[PDB]
Design an enzyme around this catalytic site. Structure first.
Site, PDB file in Angstrom:
ATOM      1  N   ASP A  90      22.959 -24.435  75.959  1.00  0.00           N
ATOM      2  CA  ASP A  90      22.204 -25.444  76.684  1.00  0.00           C
ATOM      3  C   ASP A  90      20.781 -24.927  76.879  1.00  0.00           C
ATOM      4  O   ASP A  90      20.463 -23.785  76.532  1.00  0.00           O
ATOM      5  CB  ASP A  90      22.893 -25.873  77.983  1.00  0.00           C
ATOM      6  CG  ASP A  90      23.116 -24.727  78.944  1.00  0.00           C
ATOM      7  OD1 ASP A  90      24.094 -24.814  79.716  1.00  0.00           O
ATOM      8  OD2 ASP A  90      22.324 -23.762  78.942  1.00  0.00           O
ATOM      9  N   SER A  91      19.891 -25.782  77.352  1.00  0.00           N
ATOM     10  CA  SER A  91      18.483 -25.405  77.392  1.00  0.00           C
ATOM     11  C   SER A  91      18.104 -24.643  78.664  1.00  0.00           C
ATOM     12  O   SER A  91      17.075 -23.954  78.713  1.00  0.00           O
ATOM     13  CB  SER A  91      17.617 -26.655  77.284  1.00  0.00           C
ATOM     14  OG  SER A  91      17.443 -27.216  78.580  1.00  0.00           O
ATOM     15  N   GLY A  92      18.934 -24.785  79.689  1.00  0.00           N
ATOM     16  CA  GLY A  92      18.690 -24.148  80.972  1.00  0.00           C
ATOM     17  C   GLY A  92      18.216 -25.151  82.013  1.00  0.00           C
ATOM     18  O   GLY A  92      18.064 -24.810  83.185  1.00  0.00           O
ATOM     19  N   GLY A  93      18.016 -26.394  81.581  1.00  0.00           N
ATOM     20  CA  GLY A  93      17.385 -27.428  82.390  1.00  0.00           C
ATOM     21  C   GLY A  93      18.057 -27.840  83.689  1.00  0.00           C
ATOM     22  O   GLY A  93      17.508 -27.614  84.771  1.00  0.00           O
ATOM     23  N   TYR A  94      19.228 -28.463  83.587  1.00  0.00           N
ATOM     24  CA  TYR A  94      19.932 -28.971  84.760  1.00  0.00           C
ATOM     25  C   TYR A  94      20.209 -27.876  85.787  1.00  0.00           C
ATOM     26  O   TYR A  94      20.212 -28.135  86.988  1.00  0.00           O
ATOM     27  CB  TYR A  94      21.244 -29.661  84.368  1.00  0.00           C
ATOM     28  CG  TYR A  94      22.017 -30.211  85.552  1.00  0.00           C
ATOM     29  CD1 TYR A  94      21.703 -31.450  86.101  1.00  0.00           C
ATOM     30  CD2 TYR A  94      23.060 -29.491  86.124  1.00  0.00           C
ATOM     31  CE1 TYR A  94      22.402 -31.955  87.184  1.00  0.00           C
ATOM     32  CE2 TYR A  94      23.764 -29.988  87.208  1.00  0.00           C
ATOM     33  CZ  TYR A  94      23.432 -31.219  87.733  1.00  0.00           C
ATOM     34  OH  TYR A  94      24.133 -31.716  88.811  1.00  0.00           O
ATOM     35  N   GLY A 218      21.651 -37.121  81.339  1.00  0.00           N
ATOM     36  CA  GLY A 218      21.489 -37.852  82.588  1.00  0.00           C
ATOM     37  C   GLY A 218      22.762 -38.492  83.116  1.00  0.00           C
ATOM     38  O   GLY A 218      22.710 -39.380  83.969  1.00  0.00           O
ATOM     39  N   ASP A 268      31.384 -30.978  76.573  1.00  0.00           N
ATOM     40  CA  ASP A 268      31.574 -29.669  77.208  1.00  0.00           C
ATOM     41  C   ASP A 268      31.740 -29.908  78.693  1.00  0.00           C
ATOM     42  O   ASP A 268      31.172 -30.849  79.235  1.00  0.00           O
ATOM     43  CB  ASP A 268      30.365 -28.758  76.995  1.00  0.00           C
ATOM     44  CG  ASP A 268      29.228 -29.066  77.964  1.00  0.00           C
ATOM     45  OD1 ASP A 268      28.393 -29.938  77.644  1.00  0.00           O
ATOM     46  OD2 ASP A 268      29.178 -28.467  79.071  1.00  0.00           O
ATOM     47  N   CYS A 306      53.222 -29.435  76.466  1.00  0.00           N
ATOM     48  CA  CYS A 306      52.159 -28.530  76.052  1.00  0.00           C
ATOM     49  C   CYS A 306      52.631 -27.396  75.161  1.00  0.00           C
ATOM     50  O   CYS A 306      53.616 -26.722  75.472  1.00  0.00           O
ATOM     51  CB  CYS A 306      51.489 -27.929  77.293  1.00  0.00           C
ATOM     52  SG  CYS A 306      50.090 -26.869  76.911  1.00  0.00           S
ATOM     53  N   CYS A 308      50.948 -24.617  74.507  1.00  0.00           N
ATOM     54  CA  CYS A 308      50.229 -23.366  74.753  1.00  0.00           C
ATOM     55  C   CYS A 308      51.155 -22.196  75.101  1.00  0.00           C
ATOM     56  O   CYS A 308      52.317 -22.395  75.460  1.00  0.00           O
ATOM     57  CB  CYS A 308      49.136 -23.541  75.814  1.00  0.00           C
ATOM     58  SG  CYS A 308      49.626 -23.220  77.532  1.00  0.00           S
ATOM     59  N   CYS A 311      52.675 -22.151  78.663  1.00  0.00           N
ATOM     60  CA  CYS A 311      53.812 -23.042  78.883  1.00  0.00           C
ATOM     61  C   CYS A 311      55.056 -22.594  78.116  1.00  0.00           C
ATOM     62  O   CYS A 311      56.163 -23.007  78.434  1.00  0.00           O
ATOM     63  CB  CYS A 311      53.434 -24.481  78.542  1.00  0.00           C
ATOM     64  SG  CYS A 311      52.232 -25.180  79.719  1.00  0.00           S
ATOM     65  N   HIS A 337      45.931 -22.372  79.857  1.00  0.00           N
ATOM     66  CA  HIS A 337      46.621 -23.648  79.728  1.00  0.00           C
ATOM     67  C   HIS A 337      45.646 -24.825  79.730  1.00  0.00           C
ATOM     68  O   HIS A 337      45.763 -25.731  78.908  1.00  0.00           O
ATOM     69  CB  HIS A 337      47.650 -23.868  80.829  1.00  0.00           C
ATOM     70  CG  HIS A 337      48.062 -25.297  80.943  1.00  0.00           C
ATOM     71  ND1 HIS A 337      48.950 -25.894  80.067  1.00  0.00           N
ATOM     72  CD2 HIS A 337      47.640 -26.270  81.781  1.00  0.00           C
ATOM     73  CE1 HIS A 337      49.079 -27.170  80.390  1.00  0.00           C
ATOM     74  NE2 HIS A 337      48.292 -27.425  81.422  1.00  0.00           N
TER      75      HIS A 337
HETATM   76 ZN   LIG Z   1      50.248 -25.217  78.541  1.00  0.00          ZN
END
Ligand SMILES: [Zn+2]
Ligand SMILES: [Zn+2]
EC number: 2.4.2.29
Lengths: 371, 371
Positions: A90-94, A218, A268, A306, A308, A311, A337
């Site tokens: 990211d640019s660092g802005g927000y 925005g 993101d 799930c 993962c 799980c 998870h």
């Molecule tokens: Zn999971």
């Protein structure tokens, strides 16, 4: 591999699925990009195992510590943190608007005091692009000016106009740096708040300059989902159809599904990592908070379907205990998870678009997630 | 596999190397046992990958949360935390003396208020053995009475005598429980402070009762290494030669080497995990504190010879940054390296004893570690 190639393999309504090919790897879209740098309670190999093709690094936090020049001396962000696939910065802005103090803004850029130690810093379109170069970013974000929510028509217009001037400066700074121009990509950010005419002017300006991708800026700044969806309804079609559309900072699983229905290709959010440590686990039947006493003797996994590793291996009861006790392992397991869940969601989105059944998936998802 | 079989494969002076065979696996000795439950910032698979054959669980902390009965309902500690190899459980003793409040002691046991929420609890030889059974412990520790350091001859004698009465009660409680007697092992704890005659009386009492292993208790409680080594010099030979000798709560790498030279077969310590999070990394050239500014641009691994995954993959500079920033991943990486380092040390100790060059190794180790 090429510097940048976005190919759309399938479409359904406004939704698209495809790939971005870059030097460090391929990104499947629609994509969720975990925020890599707090820092995830996860090794890079684990982040990759969840299905992530790219991670995000925050320029504001990195410029404060360990420092952009230092990271460059040490070989760049990829080498430093041990992630060898694409990184978007990211640019660092927000974060300058939201986290820093003594912030003095002007047409040239912004000066600010660190929220960590009150040290003074500067950020401009040129310096932001330079910092992203020093980090060795694969996808570089133009530096923009955010305006606090909600915004008046005048303030929205002024900040959008400044952002477009800054987008041109970002473009020129990027292009002037040979190694960056030839190896990385540059995304522009559309501004204009809730105002359709300003969004159109912003889209036109960014397209005239030309970028590799286009973010809708925005949003996710205090407005509800209805308003966000309404802005996306008219804003996304204004962007070049043949380039990726990136919705910064979004979001909850249902935000993501709705945004893909409206033409967004990239996302993101810190939510899966942030709320992971806080006890919130995402499931296909909606979020749960694992700290709740009802989970203290629950032997089921966080989510019943799930795939993962968490799980596969540990119960709600164990994770409940770990999070209640403030144990690091609790944060590790919750974060793995939640990021895995997000990637599974993105996979289901990609598969359904490819098969022309995404609208059906979106309906089925909402019905169950909110049941 | 049998319930318990300790076999000594090789000896050098007082040092021994061999194996303990139990139902859940084999333990190589001399052994370092990581403390599994704070809780390590490590998944069980990672703990195993470092070379650990067994981990320790603390009964005091587990009885407070999540509770012994609850763990039993959920299938036992192994199932709960996902570690399927042997677990040794401490009795809860030293932590009651050190961490709890309103502690009321008697011949029957101890009552105390939790340090977490001031809830009332009880611990006796019988209840300690029961709790260890509910956890499903493979190596059960007798419940003893500690006396604060330093101790007078009278207090040392009184506490040693009580401990031996409690050792008999622990033995009888263990034997009365069929499932525990047939599947787990029971270790007794020698007491007697710095006093040779009391240590001899304690050893004689424990041998008369009969245990599967023998701990040297009452050390690493404020005395320096010289004093500890002197107590070990006369105490270890008093224990049955054909059973394992366990030094509880020790310790630094040099403590371990010296203790093996004096006949100790098993060790546990929170140091590698505790000081890991604090920034201390063990190396063959002595400990370093990674927070030190001199490491901010150091691209070398934590240790130049260490075979662990952390030293394969990340620099001192990155770990320095993570620990300075208070990131979970910093604790994860430091803890993995430190536990891996400890296992590598134990491996070098085992190999050198097997090859009759342990005395030489101990000298070479000290010369370099303190250089
Ligand atoms: Zn999971
Ligand atoms: Zn290492």
């Amino acid at each position: 591999r090429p510097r940048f190639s976005f190919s759309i393999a399938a479409r359904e309504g406004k939704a698209r699925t495809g790939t971005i090919e870059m030097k460090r790897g391929v990104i499947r879209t629609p994509a969720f990009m975990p925020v890599g740098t707090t820092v995830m309670a996860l090794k890079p190999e684990t982040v990759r195992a969840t299905g992530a093709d790219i991670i995000l690094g925050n320029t504001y936090h990195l410029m404060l510590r360990p420092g952009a020049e230092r990271i460059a001396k040490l070989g760049g962000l990829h080498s430093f943190m041990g992630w060898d696939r694409p990184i978007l910065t990211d640019s660092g802005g927000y974060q300058v608007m939201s986290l820093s103090s003594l912030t003095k803004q002007s047409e040239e850029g912004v000066t600010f005091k660190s929220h960590l130690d009150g040290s003074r810093h500067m950020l401009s379109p040129e310096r932001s692009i330079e910092i992203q170069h020093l980090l060795g970013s694969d996808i570089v974000m133009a530096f923009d000016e955010c305006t606090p929510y909600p915004a008046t028509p005048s303030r929205a217009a002024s900040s959008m106009e400044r952002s477009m001037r800054w987008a041109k400066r970002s473009r020129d700074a990027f292009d002037s740096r040979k190694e960056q121009a030839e190896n990385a990509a540059l995304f522009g950010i559309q501004q204009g708040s809730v105002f359709e005419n300003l969004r159109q002017q912003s889209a036109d300006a960014l397209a005239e300059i030309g970028f590799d991708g286009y973010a809708v800026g925005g949003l996710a700044v205090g407005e509800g989902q209805d308003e966000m969806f309404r802005v996306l309804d008219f804003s996304v079609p204004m962007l070049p159809d043949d380039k990726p559309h990136y919705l910064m900072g979004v979001g909850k699983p249902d935000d993501i599904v709705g945004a893909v229905e409206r033409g967004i290709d990239m996302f993101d959010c810190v939510l899966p990592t942030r709320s992971g440590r806080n006890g919130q686990a995402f499931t296909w039947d909606g979020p749960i908070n694992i700290r709740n006493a009802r989970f203290s003797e629950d032997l089921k996994p966080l989510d019943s379907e799930c795939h993962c590793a968490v799980c596969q291996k540990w119960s709600r009861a164990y994770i409940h205990h770990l999070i209640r006790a403030g144990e690091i392992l609790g944060a590790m397991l919750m974060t793995e998870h939640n990021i895995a869940f997000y990637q599974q969601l993105m996979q289901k989105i990609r598969d359904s678009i490819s098969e022309g059944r995404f609208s059906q998936f979106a309906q089925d998802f909402r019905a169950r997630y909110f049941a």
